[PDB]
Copies of this chain bind each other. A is one copy, B any other.
Amino acid sequence: MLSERMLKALNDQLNRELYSAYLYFAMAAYFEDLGLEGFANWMKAQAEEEIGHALRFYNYIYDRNGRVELDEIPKPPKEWESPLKAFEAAYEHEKFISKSIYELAALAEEEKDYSTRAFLEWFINEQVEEEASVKKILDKLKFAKDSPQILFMLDKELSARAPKLPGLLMQ
């Protein structure tokens, strides 16, 4: 049974993963407006993964006989200056998620909660991949400062990643 402090910290991170989903959905909207479908689809697919992360906290909380409480999801930013500046904000946010993960692991070790600490190990390993994934595209946008030719080709490469949910629901 989780301590009152730990249950709150897991519930807060559940909200953070859900906001991460919403931020990337907001970024998808921004890229769609610029007519960049590849970047937009990539962001929708990334947003779906963040929903999965939230469900993992949901599942673990109930595995430890806890109770999930959903807080509000704040309004995300509407616009960014350039596709480059959107990924810089995406990378800064990924480091924010990792930092909140580290503080969860540090809290679990301080309370001697081995179950939560072992559970968080999935996300520590996961955030390494996601930070590297976002950084890889960020550096390619630094590589094409005043080049619309490369940004066009980047859009085609990222179009390979698409959201998996859309084609499974009603129609």
Chain A residues with a Cβ under 8 A of chain B: 22, 25-26, 29, 32-33, 35, 48-49, 51-52, 55, 58, 60, 62-65, 67-76, 78, 98, 101-102, 105-106, 112, 114-115, 118-119, 121, 124-129, 131-132, 135-136, 139-140, 143-144, 147-150, 152-153, 164-166, 168-170
18 sampled A-B residue pairs with Cβ under 8 A: A22-B73, A26-B70, A29-B58, A33-B62, A48-B165, A55-B166, A62-B132, A63-B128, A72-B74, A98-B115, A105-B114, A118-B125, A144-B148, A147-B148, A148-B150, A149-B153, A150-B152, A165-B168
**Contact call B51/A165, Cβ cutoff below 8 A:** yes
Are A52 and B169 also in contact (CB < 8 A) when A70-B29, A112-B102 are? yes
Closest to A63 in B: B132
Q: Which residues of B contact A55 (CB under 8 A)?
A: 165-166
Q: Which residues of B contact A49 (CB under 8 A)?
A: 169-170
**Contact call A124/B129, Cβ cutoff below 8 A:** no
Query: In the complex, what's the smallest C-beta–C-beta distance from A169 to chain B, in angstroms?
Result: 4
Instruction: Name the prevailing secondary structure of the A interface residues.
Output: helix
**Contact call A62/B32, Cβ cutoff below 8 A:** yes
In angstroms, Cα B72 to Cα A143, docked, is: 32
A52, A70, A114, A166 — which one has the most chain B CB atoms within 10 A of its CB? A114
Are A152 and B148 also in contact (CB < 8 A) when A76-B70, A166-B52 are? no
Q: Which residues of B contact A26 (CB under 8 A)?
A: 70
Query: In the complex, what's the smallest C-beta–C-beta distance from A155 to chain B, in angstroms?
Result: 10
**Contact call B119/A118, Cβ cutoff below 8 A:** no
**Contact call B73/A25, Cβ cutoff below 8 A:** no
